Amino acid sequence: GRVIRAQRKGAGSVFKSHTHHRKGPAKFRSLDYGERNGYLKGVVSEIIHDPGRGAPLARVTFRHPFRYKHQKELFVAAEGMYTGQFIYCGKKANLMVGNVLALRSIPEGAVVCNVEHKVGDRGVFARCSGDYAIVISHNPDNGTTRIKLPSGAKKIVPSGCRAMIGQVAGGGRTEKPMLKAGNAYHKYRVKRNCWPKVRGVAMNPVEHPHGGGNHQHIGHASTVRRDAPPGQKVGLIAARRTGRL
RNA sequence: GGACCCGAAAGAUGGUGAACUAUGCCUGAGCGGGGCGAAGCCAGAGGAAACUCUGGUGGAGGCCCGCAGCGAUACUGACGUGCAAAUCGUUCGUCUGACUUGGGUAUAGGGGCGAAAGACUAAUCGAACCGUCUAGUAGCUGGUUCCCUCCGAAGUUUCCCUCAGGAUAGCUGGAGCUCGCGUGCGAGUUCUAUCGGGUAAAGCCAAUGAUUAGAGGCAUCGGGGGCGCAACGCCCUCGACCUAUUCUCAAACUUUAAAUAGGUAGGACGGUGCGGCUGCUUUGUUGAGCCGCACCACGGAAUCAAGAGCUCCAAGUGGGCCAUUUUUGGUAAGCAGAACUGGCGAUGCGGGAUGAACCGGAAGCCGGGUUACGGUGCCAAACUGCGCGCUAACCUAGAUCCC
RNA sequence: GAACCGGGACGUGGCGGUUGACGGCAACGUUAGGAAGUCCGGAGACGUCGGCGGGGGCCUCGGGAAGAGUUAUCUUUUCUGUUUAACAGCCUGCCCACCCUGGAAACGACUCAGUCGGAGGUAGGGUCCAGCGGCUGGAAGAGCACCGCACGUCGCGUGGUGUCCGGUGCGCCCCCGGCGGCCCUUGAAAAUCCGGAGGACCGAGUGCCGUCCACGCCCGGUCGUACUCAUAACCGCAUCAGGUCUCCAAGGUGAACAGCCUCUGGUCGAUGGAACAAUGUAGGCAAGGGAAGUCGGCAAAAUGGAUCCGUAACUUCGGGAAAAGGAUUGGCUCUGAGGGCUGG
RNA sequence: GCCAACUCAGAACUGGUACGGACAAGGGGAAUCCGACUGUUUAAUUAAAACAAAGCAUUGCGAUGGUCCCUGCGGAUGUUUACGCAAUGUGAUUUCUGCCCAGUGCUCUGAAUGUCAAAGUGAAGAAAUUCAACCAAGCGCGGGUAAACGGCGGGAGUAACUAUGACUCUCUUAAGGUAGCCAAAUGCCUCGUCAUCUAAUUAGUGACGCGCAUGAAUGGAUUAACGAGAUUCCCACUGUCCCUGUCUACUAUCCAGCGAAACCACAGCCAAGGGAACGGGCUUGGCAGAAUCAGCGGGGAAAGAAGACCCUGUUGAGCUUGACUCUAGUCCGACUUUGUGAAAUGACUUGAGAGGGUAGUAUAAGUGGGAGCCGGCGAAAGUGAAAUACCACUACUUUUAACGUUAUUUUACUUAUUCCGUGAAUCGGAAGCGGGGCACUGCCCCUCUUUUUGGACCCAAGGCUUGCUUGCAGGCCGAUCCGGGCGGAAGACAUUGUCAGGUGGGGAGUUUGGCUGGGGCGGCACAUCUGUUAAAAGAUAACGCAGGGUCCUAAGAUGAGCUCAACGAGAACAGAAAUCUCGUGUGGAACAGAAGGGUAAAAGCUCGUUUGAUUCUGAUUUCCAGUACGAAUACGAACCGUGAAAGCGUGGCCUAACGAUCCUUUAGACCUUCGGAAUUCGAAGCUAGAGGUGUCAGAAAAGUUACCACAGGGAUAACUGGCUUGUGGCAGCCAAGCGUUCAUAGCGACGUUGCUUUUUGAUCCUUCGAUGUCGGCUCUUCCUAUCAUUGUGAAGCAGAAUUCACCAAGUGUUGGAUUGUUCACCCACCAAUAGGGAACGUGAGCUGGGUUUAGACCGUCGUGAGACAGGUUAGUUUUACCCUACUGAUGACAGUGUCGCAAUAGUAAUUCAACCUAGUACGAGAGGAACCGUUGAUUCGCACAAUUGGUCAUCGCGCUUGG
Ligand SMILES: [K+]
Ligand SMILES: [K+]
Ligand SMILES: [K+]
Ligand SMILES: [K+]
Ligand SMILES: [K+]
Ligand SMILES: [K+]
Ligand SMILES: [K+]
Ligand SMILES: [K+]
Ligand SMILES: [K+]
Ligand SMILES: [K+]
Ligand SMILES: [K+]
Ligand SMILES: [K+]
Ligand SMILES: [K+]
Ligand SMILES: [K+]
Ligand SMILES: [K+]
Ligand SMILES: [K+]
Ligand SMILES: [K+]
Ligand SMILES: [K+]
Ligand SMILES: [K+]
Ligand SMILES: [K+]
Ligand SMILES: [K+]
Ligand SMILES: [K+]
Ligand SMILES: [K+]
Ligand SMILES: [K+]
Ligand SMILES: [K+]
Ligand SMILES: [K+]
Ligand SMILES: [K+]
Ligand SMILES: [K+]
Ligand SMILES: [K+]
Ligand SMILES: [K+]
Ligand SMILES: [K+]
Ligand SMILES: [K+]
Ligand SMILES: [K+]
Ligand SMILES: [K+]
Ligand SMILES: [K+]
Ligand SMILES: [K+]
Ligand SMILES: [K+]
Ligand SMILES: [K+]
Ligand SMILES: [K+]
Ligand SMILES: [K+]
Ligand SMILES: [K+]
Ligand SMILES: [K+]
Ligand SMILES: [K+]
Ligand SMILES: [K+]
Ligand SMILES: [K+]
Ligand SMILES: [K+]
Ligand SMILES: [K+]
Ligand SMILES: [K+]
Ligand SMILES: [K+]
Ligand SMILES: [K+]
Ligand SMILES: [K+]
Ligand SMILES: [Mg+2]
Ligand SMILES: [Mg+2]
Ligand SMILES: [Mg+2]
Ligand SMILES: [Mg+2]
Ligand SMILES: [Mg+2]
Ligand SMILES: [Mg+2]
Ligand SMILES: [Mg+2]
Ligand SMILES: [Mg+2]
Ligand SMILES: [Mg+2]
Ligand SMILES: [Mg+2]
Ligand SMILES: [Mg+2]
Ligand SMILES: [Mg+2]
Ligand SMILES: [Mg+2]
Ligand SMILES: [Mg+2]
Ligand SMILES: [Mg+2]
Ligand SMILES: [Mg+2]
Ligand SMILES: [Mg+2]
Ligand SMILES: [Mg+2]
Ligand SMILES: [Mg+2]
Ligand SMILES: [Mg+2]
Ligand SMILES: [Mg+2]
Ligand SMILES: [Mg+2]
Ligand SMILES: [Mg+2]
Ligand SMILES: [Mg+2]
Ligand SMILES: [Mg+2]
Ligand SMILES: [Mg+2]
Ligand SMILES: [Mg+2]
């Protein structure tokens, strides 16, 4: 008869993201004439740590195409990039790690990161540390490029979508064991109030379908309907299978 | 309808709280002295080499003892109308981190928040607090205010999600009305005459069923012994069978069959003789009812009759209990359940020492007389009255229905 | 009494015109020493822990002088105080950072720990940075201590002496510097201020144009400000043994803001008196036995600091571990070892 | 030479061996269980094994998305992007994680139309409307899934002693407990069996295992280190105890001052009696003497609270789901938003064409004339059930356009709509400057200027041309022209809105009968019949006794004929039992069913004819209120059956076999109404049946609560008390037998009479506005049904020992292991280690180990919430100052004092050992007493401190730490 924790998540106010010390969103430059037709050069000034994000970020300074001022950008760092490096963004940019190129100019089998979904969206795919997308094939008839995403899915995107050459830096982070609750506490303190987690079978019936019983047990199948209403949809949602492979 | 008065656990609606506590966020602050001695580094020794070893340096850890801080294990200590609606004393856990803490800020009631105890959300939490709907509804508990006088119950029937309730009939009050004065439309009573019964008892030597014992007979058709190869051959024992007897039995057996109790009748609403009506009935004014006229009818058994009949409105009651006799279950019960009557309940009074039911007896306020039951050695009113026997208790002799 | 900040306006003097200073090889220095739209950088501006070093205050030892305490005996001894603010100038120049000469293995330099060097070490010579560093002015005239004269009811009167010279440190509080450890944690923003890139535009010859320089002049609103901050000034119905954030922090013992005693400061506020029955509450002891008590060793007792010797099974090899088990500990009189500065 | 600090290590000397001198400050060891550890938690009874945790595993999701919030609009995750976010389970490391997809879930690019709404389409009708096809998701079917919920049994045969079963086959239901582990925090029996630990062990440890009911991420096994966690043992230690004593402070005490509260019908001495079954009051007795002080915990069934346990109410509430009825969300179809075009494919139109036999070649598929048809067939018959010849139309399978209908797909456009990016900064076309080839003057093919470097980059130089002569100012190129789309993506799909179907404990509301020797479980005594209880009219109770929702066109109606069961005697197979003959035959047969009645030319059996099992209403009986229903009975008014007729028949031979209102539906009338008038559909009326309420005078209805609540109930359970005494315990009587013979020394079978309330039952009288619920500890008293001790009788009593019995309750009846234990069982001592009451004595006397709140684990059960007579661990014990009682203390008792008497009340002593008797009596031996006397001792009681021991704040003396 009580709202469950998963339900309470949506209202927020204690489950909102912790973003006080973050350095702003990481994204490509806004797509413009220079990147569409030629190439534009910037310089990497700093490599910084973004709290709550495994991958390091890169500060890049560009010369504004048509204004007398500096254009400052924050890119998701690719492995191998260093301070003082020159980054080239555009259709005519060379195929080097750290450069941002339109997928139409990236040959097949290339490893890229921060791939745009819609032309000009400034990058939404393969942004986490150690992750990357792979260019599979091109279709000039409809101007569409096929990519393999980190999850293994194959997606078709417009060939004008941009992507940075190389993989995201910081790979191998999840290999290290944490060994203690304090490390997880520190990890999630800068992410959100999602830790520690209380098991449903440890609660009373009033606040969870798994609660109750003189023994600790679910008492009914943990697989639930895809259309099960909020508050009832707990456990393995719409599972096509369970158990070991 | 507030509905005689007071009372629920709840439900609904609209508002108020994160000054406590829970969690996230922002910005500040706080945490002796010791122990162990990880990486990294320096030097030396052994060895053919590989490599091994030793002594220093350094200071890691959700590491250890421990002060402050934070918390609260045991005494199940103190106190337990306390210093205190959670405190005090000793003891105890942790103490550089998942650490402690101030202020600001966010989350508000079927909502929040929860390292999860249904915990916390202002001494309020398995749904906060404040006002209102609201005099919420209660077959349930408690109260329900002057006097005398008259009458005066019920715990039983049927129906009800009915079993602590209600309606219904019965019991009761009030109002009367119709008549009547012994010629009485009557009666919890007898008498006379007529009917029904299957209990008590009795019966099995009567049907059905149960059951003991012997006696006399019988078989080409029972088990054995003897005489025998067998024999429908012979002699005996026990069994069946027949006959006449015999012990003992029945709520769901019975021929017979009480006591008590049940029904009907004993005139004025009768009888007799004529005539009439019918569409009913008959072969038949043959019957069956009914209707007119004439005559007779001493009231047609006893006793009593503080009279008989009729109607309307309505209260309370619908938990009963006890006793002689009859009687079911139960070892029995101050157990549980039925029949008739009476009693207590609703009722005092004398007796049984004492007592709701036993015995007596029922009652306005008094004087006198006499009794009922029970008593007359004292307590305590009335004889140590007149008489006959029994008992002698070295066990507390014995001493009055229920008891 | 002596300073500072912000704002306003001018006057005097100074500074530049090679229109927009000079010096240094350089780091950079000097009180001044153009400039508009536009653009760029820095400060503000940041976690935590450990060692080391510097500064201020405190603590502490010795000497000089002033006063006081003790003095049956000893005590050149015991006690108190012996001060220097903001601000201005000059000097100095921690640890770092930076610059010039030069070119290094037989490698050297170097910290407690690290670390650094042909991407230029050692060495020689310099620049800059901090300071809560030094001297001077402020400022001895002030404050403090001591010794005198005077009114002796009301002179907040009047005068003198001193305020000096050294040592020491794993000491305590605060600030700072520079390294190192930790993170799947990397530990605010803005107002505001400073600097820089560019040079449109701008002036004269005995006066003009500028000037962040020196001195002089004027002004600076509104509200809070007492007191308590707690065993009686807040909350708990109270003058309630509870609860309520934080700053300062002496001496002795001792590892120690442990316990105990003491100095400054505070305080004797818990209604008082008499007696010392039982039963209680709190705190001890108890011959012999030693858990037989009790559901149960509940409670209490025992052990305990430091130094030396020594330490098993098991083990995730990190521990177990202070395992277990033994010895010592006072006072007094000595001995030895462990340092700094100066001088060829 | 001048200064400087406290660290370390040694050596003498020395004190009453004192010296971390106060203070400060681990007890240790050997094991088992749980949880890895650090951390967190029920503020005010539970700190834990519970929660979290790192590690492990599973699930969804690529943004047009997953999860979630929101009335709506829009939002959180998201300053994000799979090394991520979201939803779960397990719980370090090590090792392992077996079989089962039948069930419930979840899931799928699977077959298919078995079912499937609204809208839309077609037929009929005057229309309302009814019929058909088409028909989404979902459901059904199929597949996959167990680190999803969960499950892991039984049977038969089989090895050469037996036993088991490697092996083979089978059933429910998919499989049949694998590796492991165990009387476990998990085992009932159970205190299981064995070993060990102890003197003794329901405890601990190890082992065994058909294990009521162990078992593998509902995780199994182990595990160093850790723990205010649960357990066992050992060492040290001790006032826990033997067994108490003593010391200090503060109280209590007394005083000055000050000064409440709880509670109070009236009050307060007892024994018994009865009584509402436990009185302070009543009855009968005992007694009983002013006024006061300090305690005390027996009583006041003391106070504290309208019992929280249990039951009842037509009272809730938290939670759950396979309960009833709904609902947010979600999926799906239609219409709308919604505009502009082109093609395929499947049906329906018509239109031409091909095919078929169960047995036979064959359309003989179906039909008519065929005797005649266009050389060909019948005209003959082989199958035959029905003819081939010439005509079509009828059914089934099968191709394709002229016209038209319908449905599903593919695809085109962008302006509606939706989404993305930007400070809407170069978008579309063309042309020029340059670079390539061709062959010859034109073509086509490409580019927009920036890639060794951690620099800077803006506000136009230049050329041409005007005002007039420039303070300077105005135009073009530099800087191509033209496009009145900021740049893209999806796109009439998505999205909004309205209806329609599915899903929907996420959420709302509600329900979850009654009787009942408490309630539940059980049963139905709830409608209802027979016999009996039932007491010879009727009526009559119990969860008394023994039993009983249909069936029949005949098993109803009528007429006729006959007589059944059984027995006796006879007849081949044939007999106990087949069919047949005669005789007897009162029903001993049959009549649907339970039982009781009833019936013989019948009510039974056979046969003939039949539908009175018919229509119409009234009356009566049974039940009973003299209501209804059911059932039955006697007439009346009709039509019939049967019989010759009287007559009989209104269902079953009689006594049971059944059902209101509302609604639905059927039958009846030339019936009534639709209210402005007519006709016709439709609807509504009247009369009689049918669909049913079995809780049967008739709601529509699942659990749980230990998180719990309210109104009440002693109308009703869980103690004591009261009745009873079956059961338990303790006695008696008779005498068949036992006892070498002998019933009775000692016993007592078969029977039979009693007593007791320390057993357990039975009951429900008292108590539910509360009488504190086990056991132990302490303390007193009482009983005898006597264990020991004193005195006796009897013996199958030689002695010793033992047994039976009589006076007898004066005295005593113990220390320990295991268990919470009562109980039990062992060890030990002893004269003995008897049995019991006192509200199952005794909690304002204690304790709190157990039972019996809330936390938590295991096993079994349940889908679940949760349950458990199963186990386990942690879990607040309140108040006396009132009256009485009792213990002591003043006082009263007629001046004061001393010495005394004395009723009455209380009372106290107990048991054992040794020596001698005595190796005596007795006895064949073995063995083996007792009186007297002497010396000690046990338990208990009253005193006392010479000695010993204890006690210190003599604060007495000494020593000593820090200040
Ligand atoms: K809710
Ligand atoms: K959290
Ligand atoms: K968890
Ligand atoms: K559950
Ligand atoms: K579980
Ligand atoms: K009324
Ligand atoms: K607050
Ligand atoms: K904070
Ligand atoms: K609420
Ligand atoms: K009632
Ligand atoms: K008879
Ligand atoms: K008979
Ligand atoms: K009534
Ligand atoms: K800050
Ligand atoms: K640091
Ligand atoms: K200042
Ligand atoms: K400038
Ligand atoms: K002030
Ligand atoms: K203050
Ligand atoms: K013990
Ligand atoms: K025990
Ligand atoms: K810790
Ligand atoms: K812990
Ligand atoms: K704890
Ligand atoms: K846990
Ligand atoms: K989303
Ligand atoms: K799981
Ligand atoms: K399955
Ligand atoms: K399945
Ligand atoms: K199976
Ligand atoms: K495991
Ligand atoms: K613990
Ligand atoms: K007083
Ligand atoms: K008496
Ligand atoms: K009720
Ligand atoms: K509740
Ligand atoms: K659409
Ligand atoms: K729906
Ligand atoms: K639901
Ligand atoms: K009939
Ligand atoms: K009923
Ligand atoms: K419920
Ligand atoms: K008995
Ligand atoms: K009772
Ligand atoms: K009670
Ligand atoms: K005991
Ligand atoms: K505890
Ligand atoms: K005298
Ligand atoms: K005496
Ligand atoms: K003495
Ligand atoms: K003494
Ligand atoms: Mg579990
Ligand atoms: Mg707050
Ligand atoms: Mg500790
Ligand atoms: Mg009534
Ligand atoms: Mg009778
Ligand atoms: Mg009488
Ligand atoms: Mg009289
Ligand atoms: Mg540290
Ligand atoms: Mg010092
Ligand atoms: Mg001076
Ligand atoms: Mg400049
Ligand atoms: Mg207040
Ligand atoms: Mg020291
Ligand atoms: Mg919306
Ligand atoms: Mg479908
Ligand atoms: Mg096995
Ligand atoms: Mg285990
Ligand atoms: Mg009595
Ligand atoms: Mg109550
Ligand atoms: Mg009722
Ligand atoms: Mg006949
Ligand atoms: Mg009906
Ligand atoms: Mg004899
Ligand atoms: Mg006796
Ligand atoms: Mg006795
Ligand atoms: Mg289960
Ligand atoms: Mg006496």
mmCIF file of C-alpha atoms (C1' of nucleotides) in Angstrom, chain B residues 188 261-262 320-326 338-344 358, chain D residues 537-539:
data_model
loop_
_atom_site.group_PDB
_atom_site.id
_atom_site.type_symbol
_atom_site.label_atom_id
_atom_site.label_comp_id
_atom_site.label_asym_id
_atom_site.label_seq_id
_atom_site.Cartn_x
_atom_site.Cartn_y
_atom_site.Cartn_z
ATOM 1 C "C1'" G B 188 -58.956 -26.593 35.738
ATOM 2 C "C1'" A B 261 -55.645 -39.079 32.092
ATOM 3 C "C1'" G B 262 -58.744 -37.963 26.850
ATOM 4 C "C1'" G B 320 -35.070 -18.734 33.764
ATOM 5 C "C1'" C B 321 -34.236 -21.668 38.022
ATOM 6 C "C1'" C B 322 -35.850 -25.257 42.134
ATOM 7 C "C1'" A B 323 -39.077 -29.581 44.180
ATOM 8 C "C1'" U B 324 -42.439 -34.752 44.804
ATOM 9 C "C1'" U B 325 -43.547 -38.357 41.030
ATOM 10 C "C1'" U B 326 -42.645 -40.112 35.572
ATOM 11 C "C1'" A B 338 -37.855 -33.613 28.425
ATOM 12 C "C1'" A B 339 -43.792 -34.651 30.899
ATOM 13 C "C1'" C B 340 -47.763 -32.985 34.984
ATOM 14 C "C1'" U B 341 -48.249 -29.925 38.941
ATOM 15 C "C1'" G B 342 -46.424 -26.557 42.464
ATOM 16 C "C1'" G B 343 -42.777 -23.019 44.082
ATOM 17 C "C1'" C B 344 -38.615 -19.125 43.776
ATOM 18 C "C1'" C B 358 -37.786 -27.638 52.541
ATOM 19 C "C1'" A D 537 -55.957 -38.693 23.726
ATOM 20 C "C1'" G D 538 -52.865 -34.472 21.423
ATOM 21 C "C1'" A D 539 -48.031 -32.096 22.336
#
